[PDB]
Amino acid sequence: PLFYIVYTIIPCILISILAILVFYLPPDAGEKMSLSISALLAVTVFLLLLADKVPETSLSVPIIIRYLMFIMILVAFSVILSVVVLNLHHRSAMVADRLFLYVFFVICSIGTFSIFLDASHNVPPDN
């Protein structure tokens, strides 16, 4: 029923570009730091409204959270990384390179895990 899944995936994929770029935006342009914050606000209003949209949709027909329980975590960590990037930034190149690697590595894996969840869900629920 892939209508919504494709848009949701695109929100997270571009949003990863926001944090990747946010993260990635520190290596490439350090002064953006506070500018990066603006992204946190923005990236944070965007996700909070999505939870609401998805808050009403859930109302219409209840079922597995899988993805949500999946989408919820990913949001949270992007969320908690943004906050850490913020703290990492607030506290505030080796760490960034480190925090770029850790981010990427984390998000590739969480996204890999989350994508797996999505992959695993479609085989399980399919049966």
Binding site: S34, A76, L86, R91
Partner: protein
Amino acid sequence: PLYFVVNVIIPCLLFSFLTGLVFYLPTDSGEKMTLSISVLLSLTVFLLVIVELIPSTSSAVPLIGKYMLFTMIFVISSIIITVVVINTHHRSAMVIDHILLCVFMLICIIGTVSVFAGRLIELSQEG
């Protein structure tokens, strides 16, 4: 129906980080105060909309008024601390610890008190 008590506690907990980070984000990096300003707007729209979501819910599903006062109080103190923490910020190595110390100490207490009010109300609830 604990689906809202999770997300609400999560808004507060992360929002504490905004302030804590707002508070903690001054001492570590004061230069981002305006950038800070942006967080106040952001932190303030997010809360103002949460009062919304919750209004429709409460009015939709009736419940006891006393548990609602706590949300308001707590929310209004983060809100008042911000104002002061912003005045603080505006006015703002010793003072932030100072403000951070008096914030933390107040929020841990208030939060401790509020958590007790749930706790104690939890004590009664359990029986």
